[PDB]
Ligand SMILES: CC/C(=C\C=C\C(O)(C(F)(F)F)C(F)(F)F)c1cccc(CCc2ccc(CO)c(CO)c2)c1
């Protein structure tokens with residue numbers, strides 16, 4: 001068939017929200033504490049992630065229906081999907097050639113090794129890169145990529161959610177648009193949608209593992225003092 | 240008369256502790272979030288101060304008698320004198336010519352205006368610079384400068400102190416050395432000591448004013464999120 | 479208390 | 489609780 005004027009307006013909003021919260025030049029990276037190749041990359045990586053949280057928030061506030069939720073559910077949804085949304089949007093800078101995130105010169109070109117110097121292990125970075133590669137191979141349209149992030153964020157299956165019935169509705173409305181768009185606008189995507197919903201499941205595993213490695217990291221005050229107030233709040237358990 | 244072998248050992252320890260916690264090249268400043276001329280200098284200034292707190296701590300742990308105090312008194316003494324110790328040690332980089340702190344190229348050369356872009360006002364920066372100038376004019380020997388910091392830090396008149404009787408003793412032992420040294424080793428310092436004890440009083444006023452301007456700053460989460468975990472802990476009231 | 483998240487979400 | 493100050497003072 002063909003998209004409706006409502007589904008289409010949702011797409012215009014999400015794509016504009018993304019454009020407004022994602023700089024393809026990565027020009028703000030110079031304001032982060034400089035990178036350094038005991039966890040010498042932590043200071044820079046913490047600033048980069050803290051920066052991203054702010055962007056994910058600005059993007060979220062523009063997801064249709066999200067801003068009507070209660071402050072608490074918004075907090076609950078951000079806190080639990082934050083790291084997953086960062087992993088998804090970061091794919092835009094991932095390169096299948098050098099298997100790394102290229103956000104600028106040799107300095108802002110993050111290799112698997114660099115993240116290790118932030119306090120993480122291969123037990124996470126492995127499935128992560130494997131996720132990036134697989135996700136990249138889907139050559140998602142900008143419209144599908146932005147929809148995937150709005151769906152991941154509106155997952156009602158998050159610890160701390162209250163109105164897990166309205167959230168469930170919002171996500172479905174979005175899931176509808178994504179499926180319609182793939183059918184109407186993406187030649188060869190008979191199995192796409194399915195492959196995308198699968199990616200959400202991979203994120204939960206990555207999210208889980210990250211929470212563990214992050215927990216260990218936050219209990220050590222010599223490392224914890226390197227994080228930012230926002231990162232500590234978002235990934236903290238003091239809810 | 241002449242210094243004793245005990246007073247002399249105190250001086251060797253403090254001067255060595257200072258040398259070990261104060262880099263005259265200011266080479267670590269490149270690791271701070273870059274400076275930028277709503278409070279654009281806050282990120283850099285917060286990192287610089289956070290860095291300094293760590294140095295003041297390392298210096299303090301080496302002050303004779305300090306490490307025997309209770310963890311609580313150490314915390315209590317650091318928290319209340321921190322900003323004063325930073326103001327004193329920063330004098331080593333202050334220049335009477337350009338009335339500014341020169342820690343490197345044009346970038347790391349802090350002008351009165353820059354600190355304003357960190358959220359502070361002339362009501363503080365004025366007495367501050369006036370303090371720096373006056374302090375600089377005393378051409379203190381390295382031995383007297385380091386003693387002044389060890390005395391300021393061991394001020395028993397601090398909110399939160401318990402054994403305010405042992406602290407009072409330690410400070411006196413130090414006050415003795417400073418007075419002896421000026422008499423025996425500093426030609427023309429008949430009024431020095433007195434001028435130095437006076438500087439401590441100026442610090443209390445600067446400290447007081449800073450606490451206010453800092454309080455206002457910490458209540459605004461858009462600014463508070465720019466500070467570091469250590470700065471928030473040291474200047475926080477959550478004791 | 480999520481002091482910062484509230485501020486950013488407003 | 490001065491988590492960081494304790495760690496640095498040890
Ligand atoms: C292993 C997962 C991780 C970060 C982990 C960070 C922390 O745990 C810590 F402590 F280590 F700093 C934190 F901050 F959360 F606490 C991570 C996930 C995905 C990618 C990258 C690489 C870099 C990149 C990130 C984000 C964007 C854009 O947001 C772009 C540019 O597209 C590139 C790293």
Ligand SMILES: CC/C(=C\C=C\C(O)(C(F)(F)F)C(F)(F)F)c1cccc(CCc2ccc(CO)c(CO)c2)c1
Pocket residue numbers: 281284285287288289291325326328329330331332333340342349354357358359363364367449453456466470474
């Ligand atoms: C107005 C007082 C102040 C800092 C205030 C900072 C904050 O309130 C905030 F939020 F604004 F960032 C903080 F961090 F405390 F919360 C200040 C005091 C004395 C000097 C300077 C100028 C720079 C300089 C500092 C320290 C050293 C060495 O420690 C050297 C090199 O000698 C140079 C600034």
